[PDB]
Design a protein around this ligand. Structure first.
Ligand SMILES: [Cl-]
Ligand SMILES: [Cl-]
Ligand code: NA
Lengths: 199, 196
């Protein structure tokens, strides 16, 4: 039913977060921002307040089609330290649902807490050394179909990442229609249009 | 002294444009103040994301800042165009010799419609190109018109380029390149940052 869960924490990368939410809303998805902890507002890495609509403990995977995890170093660490967040990764993945993560999160959450063991993934370049060398992708956006896992690198790949999520969940045609107004760099747009064909 | 940037927000402001601007400028060590149009400090962005301002726009003065950065969003830009305070503030910044920057809907729905930066080259979102006199329209992703200290840009996908250009103009290309370095820009998005 085109429902996306976007956890946020103190220290989450706010432009990554908002790019994800906004882009998915443009695609007609119902996006829920859910806070780690017991305060619904959390302060992003660069001071921007992120106002969630519910707490992460109130979330259950059957209410969503996909999980999208922002980066930021402090935010990724907060995710890694959250019992509920780690459990949601397990729940989504064991329901066969797309899990998507960007920036520090694949390194500081997945690699550190044994999530998506054996999956190809990328992350922020400053954390490449956290990923097993034989599994590391240097793609700006990396999809690993076997474990329904989408990863990406940083603030400057966030739009590409969110559009790839749309392509996977709802088809490249909708992703292309959502991308056109956004004034992507021509290279970004070309790579989106070819993204599903490349699978 | 660290550069001070005013970022007005309104109901319907484009939240990814807004947050890209704020985050990127904070990465440069700048002091960034979000200020809300209307009587509430929290305003809902175009795609539902709540933006929490620190203070009211209507009590801001240009004297307290080094530059003004205006997000887009159709509803937000319309709110800006309907705000006497916002319009007078644009002129105060310009007449104090300061950079005024705007992206997407705003150069069309605010500057062109409310007769700001007459004579200036500017860009805007492609869907508003018809609002800009043909002899002044730039189709550049980022357009700087130095005579009037005016920086404009096109859309969500140009917002990072736009904010980096602001850093370059205010504090030098070295700082802009340092801020850009870890952010995983597409390599081709970084080729003209060199020359602001
Ligand atoms: Cl809009
Ligand atoms: Cl970064
Ligand atoms: Na106000």
């Amino acid at each position: 039913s085109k429902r996306i869960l976007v956890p946020v924490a103190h220290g989450s990368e706010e432009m990554e977060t908002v790019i994800i939410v906004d882009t998915l809303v443009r695609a007609g998805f119902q996006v829920t921002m859910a806070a780690v902890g017991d305060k619904l507002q959390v302060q992003g890495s660069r001071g921007v307040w992120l106002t969630a609509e519910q707490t992460l403990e109130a979330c259950s995977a059957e209410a969503f089609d996909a999980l999208a995890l922002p980066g930021g170093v402090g935010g990724a660490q907060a995710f890694a330290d959250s019992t509920a967040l780690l459990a949601l990764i397990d729940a989504f993945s064991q329901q066969g649902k797309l899990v998507a993560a960007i920036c520090a999160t694949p390194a500081l959450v997945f690699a550190k807490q044994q999530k998506f063991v054996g999956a190809r993934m990328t992350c922020h370049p400053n954390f490449f050394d956290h990923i097993p060398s034989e599994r590391l992708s240097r793609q700006r956006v990396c999809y690993y179909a076997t474990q329904h896992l989408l990863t990406s690198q940083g603030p400057g790949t966030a739009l590409e990442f969110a559009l790839a999520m749309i392509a996977l969940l709802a088809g490249v045609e909708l992703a292309q229609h959502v991308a056109a107004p956004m004034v992507l760099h021509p290279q970004q747009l070309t790579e989106l249009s070819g993204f599903i064909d490349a699978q």
